[PDB]
Symmetry: D2
C-alpha cells in the first residue's frame, strides 16, 4: 500500500506558467529564491554497508521541498487569497489564519484575503454572505486564544456551488485547513475549477491533532495536545499516589492512532500502562499489568487512547476500562483493600487552546511556505514535515493511507522502557532495590555521625 | 569542515560483548540490534530523479542509537556514575532521573552514583559527597529546575578522577555538559584505557544554545524558546501601550542566534532580530527602527547576548537600549513622548523544568545513552539529526561549533516577519488602507441589512 | 442561634514556657487574646460616638503567643491528611514541619499515612519521620506525600497510638467528617488526662466552611476551572450555534462554578445547587442567548439538578441541550454541543502563588496556636484576618452561595437575563458598531489623502 | 491619619431622577434605597460584654452597590475611559468590564476610549479616541497592556473638559495612580465650575498595593505569581552551586508588598529586603554568612526601593557587594557563585491571574453602577473583603507601606534567616531528627527484605 507508492504519486501539480517575478524584498538578494525544484529522500537510510562511494537510499522516492520561488504563477497585486477552516478545532488554527494573511499582505502585497466562515458551508451560496475581509489589523492578536475566528463545520458542500463562489469573489488561491475529508473535497474543487478553465490553486494545510498523516512526522497542534495530556496525567498520578492501591485512568484523543497517548506517556514520566489501538490486548492482559504494578508499588497510572478496545462492548473506553478496573479490584479486596480508581477525561481541553511556542513556530512556518508555493502555482497538494524539512505532497497519495504507531519504531520502544513488563522477576528486582536503598541509608548514617562529631 | 571523513564518525566500542541484553521491556528478542544501522548525514540527492534510487550529496553515515542484542558490561556487577557540569539547563533532573531508572528498571545495574558539583565530585576530597541514586531518590526530581547533584565549571586532574572511578567500581560515567566537559570526558576515557581499566565515558550534550554540530536539537533549547516568548510578550505589551514604544529583549546566544531566531518567530511579535552571525551597525539598526515607525507606533527588538561585541563580554542589552533612547531623544520632533522598555529574562529561560516535548527528548536521550554505554560505546555523545537519535565521537563533535545558516530555512522565516529596507512602505500602507476600507464597507452593509429586518 | 460561648476556643491548662522564637523583640508576641467582630457593619447611622456591630459575636484572632503550653524540645507534632486531595496539601505539611522545626525546635514531626488509618495500630507502622530535608521540594507537586483515606477509625485505638509515639499535637487536615472525628480524639485524650492538642486545618476545595470567606485550594480550583471554560468557549464560538458545557465540582455549594463563571468572563449560564431551576428555564436562557449570538457557554456545579432523574448532571444536561436543539433544527441548523468534565484536574495540582501564601500562613499560625495550647478548633479566614473557631460550631452548619450576596449579583451581570428587550438591545448595539465603522472610514480616507 | 468621617463622605451629583433599568437581578428589592457602611477598623475597643462590640476607629467607609435610582438617563449617557501610567495586569479586563456593564446592564448610548492617557482628552489627541462597542472588547482580556495606550503626562483641565463637553461624555473612568486621580479630581471640579453634568470616577492602578483605605489593588496578586517564577529560577541556580546565591530584584519603589508576598509564596526565600526596613550592607552579609553556616545556597529578594543610602539599581549594587564579600572570604566559601535575575516588566506586562480577572471585572462593574448612581471625585477600593468608595482627596493624601509589626511581615521573618537562634544547637537537633528517620527506614527495609 505504502510500498505501492511511485515517484509519480509524489509529483506535485503546478498550474501552467510562472510569468511574474517574486516581489519579496524580505531576503538579502534574489539568489535566495529557487530557480528549480529541490528534493529530499523519503528514506535517508543507506541500502548497502558503508563503501568508498556515497550512500544510496533504501527507497526510490524523493519528496519535493517547499521554498519561495524566483518565478510565481499569480500576479500578486491582482491575487485574492481565500481561507477556510473545517472539522474539529486544533491548537494553532488562529496562528495559521494569521500567518497566511500576513504572508499574503506583507510579502506578496496581494489585493485581498477572504475568510470563509464555518467550513465549506462558508463557500455555499447562502454561506458566502458571511465571508469576512482579513486585513492586517484584523489578525494582529488572534494567536493569543483557541478556536478559529472563521469557525468550522464537518459537512461537505456542492463542489459546483463552491467553485461558483470562488469565481464570483475572484479568489485565485483557496487554503483548505482540515483533515483527509476536507483535503479530498479540496482536490474535487481543484478539478472542478480546471474543468471550467478557471485559474485557481487549492492548497491544503493538514489539520489532525492525532499526528496520523502519512509522508509526515509532525502535524500542527500535536505537541500542544501532548503538553495538555501531560497536565491530565500529572493530576491522575497525584490522585493515584495519594491512595493506598490508587489507580489513575486518563483517556486521551486517538481514534485510530496512539501518537498522543504514547508521547504523553513518555513526556509525563509517570505512566505505568499505555493502551493504543495499534496494540489491542485483552481486559485480562490489562488487569495482569495492574496486578504486577501492585506487587511492589501502591499506585498505577493507565493512559488509554479513545480508539483502544473497541471490541470490549464509538463506545467510551475510558468509562468501560474504569468500571472493569473497579470490578477487578472489588473481586480482590483481600489483596488490595480500600483501593481507589480516579478517571480523568480532559477531552476538548487538549485541542481548544492556543499552541505551545514550538507549535506557534511550526504553524507560522507551514502557513508562510504554503503561501510561497501556492503563489508559485502549487495546487492539489498539502504542506507537511518529514526529517526536519518542509515538503509538498499531492492530496491523492496523502489521503490514500492513514499513519499509525510503528510497534517496532523508536517511540513505542521508549513507551515500553517506562511501562510495566510481565517478563522480569519482580521479587529479585525489589530485593536489589532494597540493597540500593540500604546503601544510601548507611552512607547517610555515616556522613551524619561524622558531621555530628565536629558539632 | 567539509574535510570530515567516515573515520571521524566511527564510534569507539570497548572490546567484547560477552553478555546477552537482559531487557524484558520489548515483545521479543528480535527488537534488539544484531549489527550497527546507519542514517545519511545529508538526505538530499546528488543527481535529479532517475530510474535508480537516489544518492547522498555527502559520503558521511552517522551511527544510529538503539538497544543491542549483546552488551559489554555484566549488568548485575555494573556501577553507573553521573556528573552534571557547567550552567544548568531545563531537563537536567529529567536526564539524571532517566539514566538512573533505565540503569535500574531495564538493566538491573548494581548501583548508580551521582557525583556532586561537576568534575569536582570525582576529585578525592569531592568524592565523599557523592550520593546513592536509588529508584525512590529520583521519583519527583523532574518537577523542578537545576541539578540535584549540583554543577561547577572547573576541570580536575584526570588521574585523580580515574582513581575515584576505580575505587568506587564505576564502569560507566555519563558526562552531562558542554564541549569543555566532553573534551575532559574523552581525556578520562583515554586515561582509563592507558591503565587497562574497563570504563565507558559517555556524553549527554548540555548546551541550551543548540550550537552542537552533527545535531539539529539539544535538550532544553525548546524550553528556553518557550520562556524567551514570555519575555517578548511582555516587551510587546509595554511597547504597544506607548505612542512610539520600543521593547528590547536580550536572550542567551553567546556565539549563535538559535534562541533569538526561534523566539522571534514563535512570539509572532518581533520587528528586529539581532544575532552574532549577522553583524550590522548601530546606524543599520536605527534605520530598521525608523522604518517600522513610518506606519506603526510600536517596535520589538530581540538581541542575542553575542550580537554587537564591536559596539564598545559587554552587555549589548543595556548598550542597545541606551543607543535607541539616544536616537529617539535626537528625534523628539518625529517621535514625541517615545518610550524604551528593556527586559533581560537572563537565567529564567534555563533555570526551570522542561516543556513536555523537552521531557520526552531528555528521557529518550538518557535511555538510549544507557543502552549504548552498556553495549560498550565510549568517547562519544548522543545527538539528534533528521528526527533520529545518533552517536558521534566527542573528538569531531568538539572540533566545530554550529551557527545560524543565514541562507537556511529558520533565518528565512525570521526575515519574513521582521522589517526590510527594500519595500515601498508608503505603497504598502496605501494598499492596507484599501483592504481595511473594503472590510469596513462589507461590515457596514451587513449591519444596515440586519438593522432593516429589526 | 450562635452565642459568644459557641466561639470560645478551648485552651489546654497552663502556659508555663516562654516562646523560644528568635524570628521577631519580645513585644511582638501576644500577652492576651485579641478579637475581631464577626460582622463589621454598623447597627446605627454615622454618629459622634464610634460605630457598633450589628452582631454581638467576636472571633478569636490567631497569633504567636508570649507564653506557650508545650515544652518545645520535648514536643512531638503529628500530621494526618484525610479525604480527597486539594491544591496546597503538601504546602501545609511542609509549613507545619518547617514552623515546628525552624521556629519552635520541636523534638520530632511524624506524618501518619493514608488518613486516620495511619493512627490505627496496624497503620502506625507506616508513619514517616518529617525532618527538614524530607519536605524541601514537596510543594512543587500535587497530592499528599502522606496519602489519604475517607474512613474513620476507633478514637480509643488512635489515642493509644498518640500516647505510644509521644505525640503532643495532632494536626488534622480534612473536611467536616475529619474535624468531627478530631474533636472526638481531643475529648478521649482529655478523658484519660493525656496532654494532647488536636488542631484542624480545614480542607474543602468547595469553600463551604461557615465562619470563613476562603479555604485553601479554592482559588487554585477556580484557576483550573477557567482553563476548562476557555476550551468550552473556543469549541462553542468555532461552531454556528455552538454550545460549550463545563461541569465543575460543587456537591452542595456553587462557589467554584460562580467564581469560575465571572473569572472566565466567557460564561452565559451558571447553574448551582442553591438556585434550582427547571430543564425548561435552562432551555429558555439558551434560546435567548441564541437570538442575537451564535455561541453559548453553560457552567454547571455537580450538585445542580439532582431532581432531573449521585447522577451525572454534566452528561444529563448535555443530552437535554442536544435533544432541545435537534427538536429546533429549523431555527438552529447544524448546531453542536461540546461537554468538558475537568473533574480531578482542578484539585490534584500544586497551588496558585496566592494559595501557596495562604497555605504557608494557615499552617504557620496553626503551629503557633497549638503550641500555645489551642485544641478542638480550626484556623480560618474572615475579613482578611486569620481566626480560630471551635470545631463544634464550624461543623454544625454548611456555607452556601448567598443568592442576594455580592458574588451571585456579579454572576447575573455577565449571564443572560429573561427581562430585557433583545431586539431593542441589538438595535442599539448595531448603532454603536456603525458609529465605530463610520469614524474609522473617515480617519482612514483622511490619512490616505496625505500619503 | 488626622482623618475624619467628613473626609470619607463620597460626593454625589445632584438628583436621582431615573429608575435602574438593570433586568439582571431577580426583583427590584436587590437594588439599594440608601447608602450602607462598613467599619474602617472592625476590631473591638473593650473585651466581650453583654452589649454589641464597638470599633476602635470612629470611621465608616461607604459600600459600593447597584442603586434603585440613578443620576444619569441611561439611553442618553456616554461613558469615557482613559488609562494612564505604567501598564498593570488586568488593564484590558477593566476596559472590557466598564464597556460591557455600560452596554449589557445600563444600555448606555456610547462608550469612548481616550488613547495614550490624559493626552487622549487634549484637543489634538481626541481625534484618536476609539468607539468601544461590545464586539471590540470581546477578546482583549487574553493579552497584556492597554488597547487604549498610556502616557504619564498631565494635560490642561480646561482643554480636557472642553473635549468631554464636545463629545457628550457624562462619566469619565480614570484608570491610573495617585497622579492620575489628583488630576481626575481637578477635571471633576472644572466641570462643576462650568455647571456641566459629569461624573469623574477612579479605578486605582498600582501594582505595588500601596493604596490607603485598601488591602488589595488589581494586578498585585498577578505580579506576585510572576515574581515567584523569578524566585524559582534564582533558587534553581543557587541550589545547583556549592555556596550559590540567587538575587531577585522586584518592583517596590516605596513599599515591599510584592517582595514580601513573593518571598512567602515562593517558600524558597532566605533574605527579604524592603524599603520599610533599611539595614546595612554589613547586616545583609551577616544574614548571608549565617545561612551558609549549615546550608550551601541562599536566595535574596530585594525591592527596587531598598538601600537607596548605599551610594540607583540596588539589584546590580547588591550583587556586586555579595560577590565582593564572597571573594574577600574565598577560604570559607570556595568556588562560590552569585546569579542575579531582574524580571522587571515581565511581572506587570501580562494578562491577570484568574483571581485578578474576577477582581478587575467586579471593580469595573461596581464602578459603573456607582457612577450611573451619581458618585464622583472618588475611587473604588477593597477592604476586609468588601468593595467600598473613598474620595480621591483622602486616598491621595497618604501612601500605604508594610506594617513591620503586621501579619505578612511576621510570616516573612518565620521563613527567613534570624541572627538570634543557636545554629550549632539547631543543626545538632536536625541531625537527631534525620538519624531517627534513617533508623526507622533501616528497620522497615530489613523487615520487608526478610519476607522477600
Ligand atoms: N527510563 C525512564 N524514563 C522516564 N521515566 C521513566 C523511565 N522508567 C520509568 N519511568 C517512569 O518513572 C516512574 C518512577 O516511579 P516508580 O515507578 O514509582 O519508581 C515509573 O512509574 C515510570 O512511570
Ligand atoms: N509571516 C508571518 N508569520 C508570523 N508572524 C509574522 C509574519 N509576518 C509578520 N509577523 C508578525 O506579526 C506582527 C503583526 O503586527 P503588525 O505588523 O503591527 O500588524 C509583525 O510585527 C510581526 O512581528
Ligand atoms: N460586566 C462583565 N464583566 C465581565 N465579563 C462580562 C461582563 N458582562 C458580560 N461578560 C462576559 O463577556 C462576554 C462578552 O462577549 P459577548 O457576550 O459575545 O459579547 C459575555 O458573553 C459574558 O460572558
Ligand atoms: N514556615 C515556613 N513556611 C513556608 N516556607 C518556609 C517556612 N520556613 C522556611 N521556609 C522556606 O523553606 C525553605 C526550606 O529549605 P531549607 O531551608 O534548606 O530547608 C527555606 O529556605 C525557606 O525559604
Amino acid at each position: 500500500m505504502l510500498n505501492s507508492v511511485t515517484q509519480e504519486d509524489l509529483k506535485v501539480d503546478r498550474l501552467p506558467g510562472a510569468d511574474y517575478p517574486n516581489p519579496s524584498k524580505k531576503y538579502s538578494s534574489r539568489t535566495e529564491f529557487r530557480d528549480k525544484t529541490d528534493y529530499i529522500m523519503y528514506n535517508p537510510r543507506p541500502r548497502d554497508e558503508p563503501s568508498s562511494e556515497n550512500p544510496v537510499s533504501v527507497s526510490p522516492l524523493l519528496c519535493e521541498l517547499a521554498a519561495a520561488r524566483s518565478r510565481i504563477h499569480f500576479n500578486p497585486t491582482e491575487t485574492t487569497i481565500g481561507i477556510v477552516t473545517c472539522g474539529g478545532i486544533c491548537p494553532g488554527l488562529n496562528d495559521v489564519i494569521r500567518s497566511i494573511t500576513l504572508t499574503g499582505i506583507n510579502v506578496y502585497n496581494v489585493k485581498r484575503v477572504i475568510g470563509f466562515r464555518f467550513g465549506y458551508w462558508g463557500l455555499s451560496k447562502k454561506g458566502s454572505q458571511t465571508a469576512i475581509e482579513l486585513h492586517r489589523g484584523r489578525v494582529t492578536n488572534i494567536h493569543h486564544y483557541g478556536g478559529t475566528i472563521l469557525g468550522s463545520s464537518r459537512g461537505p458542500q456542492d463542489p459546483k456551488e463552491m467553485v461558483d463562489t470562488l469565481e464570483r469573489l475572484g479568489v485565485n488561491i483557496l487554503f483548505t485547513v482540515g483533515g483527509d475529508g476536507t483535503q479530498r473535497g479540496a482536490l474535487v474543487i481543484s478539478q472542478e475549477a480546471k474543468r471550467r478553465g478557471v485559474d485557481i490553486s487549492v492548497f491544503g494545510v493538514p489539520k489532525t491533532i492525532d499526528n496520523d498523516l502519512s509522508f509526515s512526522h509532525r502535524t500542527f497542534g500535536f505537541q500542544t495536545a501532548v503538553e495538555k495530556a501531560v497536565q491530565a496525567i500529572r493530576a491522575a498520578y497525584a490522585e493515584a499516589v495519594s491512595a493506598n492501591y490508587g489507580v489513575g485512568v486518563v483517556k486521551l484523543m486517538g481514534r485510530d492512532s496512539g501518537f498522543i497517548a504514547a508521547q504523553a506517556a513518555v513526556a509525563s514520566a509517570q505512566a505505568n500502562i499505555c493502551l493504543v489501538p495499534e496494540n489491542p490486548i485483552s481486559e485480562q492482559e490489562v488487569m495482569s499489568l495492574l496486578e504486577r504494578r501492585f506487587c511492589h508499588s501502591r499506585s498505577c497510572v493507565i493512559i488509554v487512547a479513545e480508539g483502544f478496545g473497541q471490541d470490549w462492548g464509538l463506545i467510551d473506553i475510558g468509562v468501560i476500562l474504569t468500571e472493569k478496573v473497579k470490578a477487578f479490584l472489588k473481586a480482590n479486596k483481600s489483596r488490595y483493600p480500600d483501593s481507589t480508581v480516579k478517571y480523568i477525561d480532559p477531552s476538548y481541553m487538549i485541542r481548544a487552546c492556543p499552541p505551545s511556542a514550538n507549535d506557534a513556530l511550526f504553524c507560522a512556518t507551514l502557513a508562510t511556505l504554503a503561501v510561497h508555493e501556492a503563489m508559485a502555482g502549487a495546487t492539489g497538494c498539502i504542506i507537511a514535515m518529514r526529517h526536519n524539512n518542509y515538503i509538498l505532497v499531492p492530496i491523492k497519495v496523502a489521503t490514500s493511507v492513514r499513519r499509525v504507531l510503528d510497534l517496532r519504531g523508536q517511540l513505542w520502544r521508549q513507551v515500553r522502557e517506562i511501562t510495566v513488563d510481565l517478563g522480569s522477576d519482580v521479587r529479585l528486582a525489589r530485593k536489589l532495590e532494597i540493597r540500593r536503598e540500604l546503601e544510601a541509608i548507611n552512607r547517610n548514617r555515616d556522613r551524619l555521625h561524622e558531621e555530628l562529631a565536629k558539632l
